[PDB]
Amino acid sequence: QPQKCQREFQQEQHLRACQQWIRQQLAGSPFSENQWGPQQGPSLREQCCNELYQEDQVCVCPTLKQAAKSVRVQGQHGPFQSTRIYQIAKNLPNVCNMKQIGTCPFIAI
């Protein structure tokens, strides 16, 4: 909503490790050893948890909704990914406390 960040976050410094680790929750990524998911890329949470905060708190959200909106869809995939994509992107600010105030206090989805 706030362009002050929605204009600086999407300007040319969106997210990836944040909107990418979630992509590892599917078959959209390879696998080798054991791990919560991205065994070959475990360094994504502590990375995104920062790569999402590095843009300040005015970017932590709802701006993130962006990097999360393009976490999969990119033309028309109907209501499917966003559902879980969000149900798994809502636990990010839970273990990556990056929103003290409450920009995107979503979860009841």
| Contact (Cβ atoms closer than 8 angstroms) between residue 60 and residue 99 | yes
Do 37 and 49 touch, CB atoms closer than 8 A?
Answer: no
Tell me the CATH number at 105: 1.10.110.10
Rounded-to-integer distance, Cα 84 and Cα 89, Å: 8
Looking at the structure of the chain, the number of domains it has is: 1
Range of the domain at 19: 1-109
Work out the end-to-end distance of the chain between its first and last CA atoms, rounded to an integer number of angstroms: 19
Instruction: Give the amino acid at 67.
Output: A
CB 66, CB 103: distance < 8 Å: no
Amino acid at residue number 14? H
CB atoms within 10 A of CB 109: 10
